[PDB]
Write an enzyme that holds these catalytic residues in place. Structure first.
Site, short mmCIF file in Angstrom:
data_model
loop_
_atom_site.label_atom_id
_atom_site.label_comp_id
_atom_site.label_asym_id
_atom_site.label_seq_id
_atom_site.Cartn_x
_atom_site.Cartn_y
_atom_site.Cartn_z
N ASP A 173 -5.57 -7.82 -3.74
CA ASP A 173 -5.88 -6.71 -2.83
C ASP A 173 -4.61 -6.28 -2.10
O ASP A 173 -4.27 -6.81 -1.04
CB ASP A 173 -7.02 -7.03 -1.85
CG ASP A 173 -7.41 -5.95 -0.84
OD1 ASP A 173 -6.79 -4.87 -0.82
OD2 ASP A 173 -8.36 -6.20 -0.06
N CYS B 99 -4.17 4.59 -5.04
CA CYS B 99 -5.48 4.32 -5.63
C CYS B 99 -5.48 3.09 -6.55
O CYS B 99 -5.25 1.97 -6.10
CB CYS B 99 -6.02 5.57 -6.30
SG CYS B 99 -6.26 6.93 -5.13
N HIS C 247 -11.82 2.00 -1.71
CA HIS C 247 -10.82 0.95 -1.87
C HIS C 247 -10.77 0.40 -3.30
O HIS C 247 -11.80 0.12 -3.91
CB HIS C 247 -11.08 -0.17 -0.86
CG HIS C 247 -9.88 -0.99 -0.58
ND1 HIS C 247 -8.70 -0.38 -0.19
CD2 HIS C 247 -9.61 -2.31 -0.61
CE1 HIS C 247 -7.77 -1.31 -0.01
NE2 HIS C 247 -8.29 -2.49 -0.27
N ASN D 203 0.83 -1.20 0.00
CA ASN D 203 0.00 0.00 0.00
C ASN D 203 0.87 1.26 0.00
O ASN D 203 0.89 2.01 -0.98
CB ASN D 203 -1.00 0.04 1.16
CG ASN D 203 -1.93 1.23 1.09
OD1 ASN D 203 -2.45 1.67 2.13
ND2 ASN D 203 -2.13 1.80 -0.09
#
Ligand SMILES: O=C([C@@H]1CCN(CCc2ccccc2)C[C@H]1c1ccccc1)N1CCC(O)(Cn2cnc3ccccc3c2=O)CC1
EC number: 3.4.19.12
Length: 335
Positions: A271, A13, A254, A8
């Site tokens: 993810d 984005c 998310h 992350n």
């Protein structure tokens, strides 16, 4: 799975979602590793940085980082990613790499994979006058409002608009006239990038906002009937490969992506740092909407599946590159 994730590390984005998409376009990956970045400066070469990411996605056991990438194309204002489309990110990345590939054995790879062609026309009813402009395209922006599905969106894209009183065409020498205005496809590329237009201008608050309406897309997509001419040896039949997804709003939001990287209908959910097996229903129908839904689809042409998705080995990565990265990874033992 044996596939690895991206860290992350900020507010990037859709960035991680795009990167996995490009990585599993295997044909692109190989030609990316062939770039001559031997002389380029570590910190400011975008081509080198993409090489590094792809290498790590291929070799690492641990989630992979991207600061050096972000740094290299220089999106570091508070509103950098918030004020841009996915396809703007795509164009920045693939245009840097196209240029680096000229004069090599792998020149022209980007256009081969992504670019198709298209004709926009105006034709006068009563008088003899027509204007044709031909354009190349790397992606397509589809309208979702009032549309059940991809077929409806396509029908609308090639729709004949009508020019009447007050909306007549100015045909120059001939003055104001009545005309038909339209668009046709001449060719659809091997790899099809489709953005769904879900971020739309609100007149009531003078801003753009997200539409969460239902919108269906199929696993298998025939498009011959939207071509000006067909070829029985290569029908425009496409397969779904990637579903780029988003949930929420500007308060909380998310980004995630669903892939079946081998084109075999076996799907995985990506993810950030966590990659996991998932069902076909989780990749497709649970992303229709009607809140987590799709904003970008990637389709691959049936006849081109095996070439685009050709296998990759560690031998496809040159020594000179490998040695440069082993060096950085040695200095990265500072705890
Ligand atoms: O991540 C975003 C948006 C960033 C901004 N986000 C909200 C932030 C905000 C702050 C303060 C006030 C208001 C809002 C909305 C996010 C979004 C998510 C999901 C759906 C649509 C938007 N992306 C990538 C995908 C995106 O590129 C697809 N696409 C592509 N091409 C088109 C062409 C013509 C019309 C619409 C689109 C479109 O939505 C939109 C931007």
């Amino acid at each position: 799975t044996g596939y690895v994730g991206l860290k992350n590390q900020g507010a990037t984005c859709y960035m991680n979602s795009l990167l996995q998409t490009l990585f599993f376009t295997n044909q692109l990956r190989k030609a990316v590793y062939m770039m001559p970045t031997e002389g380029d400066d570590s910190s400011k070469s975008v081509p080198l940085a993409l090489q590094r990411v792809f290498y790590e996605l291929q070799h690492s056991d641990k989630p992979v980082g991207t600061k050096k990438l972000t740094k290299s194309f220089g999106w570091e204002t508070l509103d950098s990613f918030m004020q841009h489309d996915v396809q703007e990110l795509c164009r920045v990345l693939l245009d840097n790499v196209e240029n680096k590939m000229k004069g090599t054995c792998v020149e022209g790879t980007i256009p081969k994979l992504f670019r198709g062609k298209m004709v926009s026309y105006i034709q006068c009813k009563e008088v003899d006058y027509r204007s044709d402009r031909r354009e190349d395209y790397y992606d397509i922006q589809l309208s979702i409002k009032g549309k059940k599905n991809i077929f409806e969106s396509f029908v609308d894209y090639v729709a004949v608009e009508q020019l009447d009183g007050d909306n007549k065409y100015d045909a120059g020498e001939h003055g104001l006239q009545e005309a038909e205005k339209g668009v046709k496809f001449l060719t659809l590329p091997p790899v099809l990038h489709l953005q769904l237009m879900r971020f739309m201008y609100d007149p009531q608050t003078d801003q753009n906002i997200k539409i969460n309406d239902r919108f269906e897309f199929p696993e298998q997509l025939p498009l011959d009937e939207f071509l000006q001419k067909t070829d029985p040896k290569d029908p425009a039949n496409y397969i779904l490969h990637a579903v780029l997804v988003h949930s929420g709003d500007n308060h909380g939001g998310h980004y995630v992506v669903y892939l079946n990287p081998k084109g075999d209908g076996k799907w995985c959910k990506f993810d950030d740092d966590v990659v996991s097996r998932c069902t076909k229903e989780e990749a497709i129908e649970h992303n229709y909407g009607g809140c987590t839904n799709a904003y970008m689809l990637v389709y691959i042409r049936e006849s081109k599946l095996s070439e685009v998705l050709q296998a990759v080995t560690d031998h496809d990565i040159p020594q000179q590159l490998v040695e440069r990265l082993q060096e950085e990874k040695r200095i990265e033992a500072q705890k």
